[PDB]
Amino acid sequence: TCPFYKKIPGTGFTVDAFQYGVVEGCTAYFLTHFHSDHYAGLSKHFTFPVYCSEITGNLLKNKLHVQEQYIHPLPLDTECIVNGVKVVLLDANHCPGAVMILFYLPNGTVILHTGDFRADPSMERSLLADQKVHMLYLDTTYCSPEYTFPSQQEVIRFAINTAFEAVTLNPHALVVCGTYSIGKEKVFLAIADVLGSKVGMSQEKYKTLQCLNIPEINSLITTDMCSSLVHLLPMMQINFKGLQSHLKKCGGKYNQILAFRPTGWTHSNKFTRIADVIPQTKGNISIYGIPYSEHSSYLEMKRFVQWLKPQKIIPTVNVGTWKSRSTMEKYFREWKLEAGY
Ligand code: NI
């Protein structure tokens, strides 16, 4: 059954609650972003209103074939009414189209649901600064202090210099980048840009990217593999066996593959700096795993919650075990005591 942390009290709303059939008493289903765990259950046969951003909107229409009449896109940073309730969608700094939602309840309670987010100081100067938030439905993906990672800027600098260097030394080297969902486009686009190439991908993935309202996107991507030296593949295929195979496919146009696996966190973040990262090499094929996160680090999360000073916090990630739940509650109590709310 639909769990409690997907329900918004004193409304008939749910958030990311599409895999439970008809939820008893839901008049409107919100979708925070186009990732499968979140949209799981949607299809062309869904006949209740869905509320979402314009971009998530384009992907439901064209990737899932949901009927236009049921998609309700809303602009960001704008006070809107949905079944008698004031709401606002805010940028989540997760993947394209990803939003946080503010609900203003009839009784005067204010509720922020973060969806998936990477907390940032820029959020402290949004519509959030203008009033008090009583309840916080929080992406707690990395709520533990071991979870440090570099900024997105630093990681992009690394990958750019790595790729430029390798291709200037050996002009017959191919760059390959792994992907399995939206998000993390900056990796492959920034590499393509330093290298004077467009990115080449499958038809399904080109379609996916054509939905994202990216500026000058027609100039940055293609379905013509051959005319491009930055290729996207299924993340599954990023390994020595799957790369060697793909190397054959290019027909002696390239002798070396340099490839990037944008991970979330990996235990090597507990020891090594971004400057000191190294690849796995098997002959003419190297694989870098780079820690490009679209979720808050522990410290970014902590700062945002201590700035927001909510009265109650409800987790949406790592909720399935008592050990996780108990650990999170401990950190929430530390933050509240250190900051005095
Ligand atoms: Ni997500």
What CATH number does the domain containing 235 carry? 3.40.50.12650
Of 156, 107, 138, give the one whose Cα is nearest residue 260. Answer: 156
If one counts the domains in the chain, the total is 2
CA 142 to CA 299: how far, in whole Å?
A: 10
CA 179, CA 34: separation in Å to the nearest integer? Answer: 14
Q: Which domain holds residue 96?
A: 1-147+296-341
For this PDB entry, the determination method is X-ray
> What is the rounded CA–CA span in Å between residue 238 and residue 246?
10
Task: Calculate how far, in angstroms, residue 103's C-alpha sits from the geometric centre of ligand 1.
Answer: 21
Please identify which residue in the block is written with the tokens 């946080």: 100
Label residue 246 left, alpha or beta by phi (over 0 means left) and psi (-120 to 50 means alpha). alpha
89, two tokens: 């969608």
User: Which residues touch 33 (CB under 8 Å, ≥6 apart)?
Assistant: 53, 56, 92, 94, 95, 97, 98, 99, 115, 116, 182
Supply 247's token pair. Answer: 């190397």
DSSP 41: T
Q: How far is the CA of 33 from the centre of ligand 1 (A)?
A: 7
Do 273 and 337 sit in the same domain of this protein?
no
Distance 98 CA to ligand 1 centre (A): 8
Angle at 120 between CA 115 and CA 121, to 5 degrees: 135
- The CATH code of the domain that includes 139 is 3.60.15.10
In sequence order, which residues have a C-beta less than 8 Å from that of residue 225 and are 6 or more positions away? Answer: 200, 231, 250
With contact defined as beta carbons under 8 Å apart, do 258 and 166 qualify?
A: yes
Q: How far is CA 197 from CA 5, 90, 105, 210, 229, in A?
A: 45, 33, 50, 18, 6
Q: What are phi and psi of 278, to 5 degrees?
A: -135, 155
Pair (12, 107) in one structural domain: yes
User: Same structural domain for residues 19 and 143?
Assistant: yes
Question: What's the 40 CA to ligand 1 centre distance in angstroms?
Answer: 12
Burial class (CB in 10 A: 0-12, 13-18, 19+), 327: middle
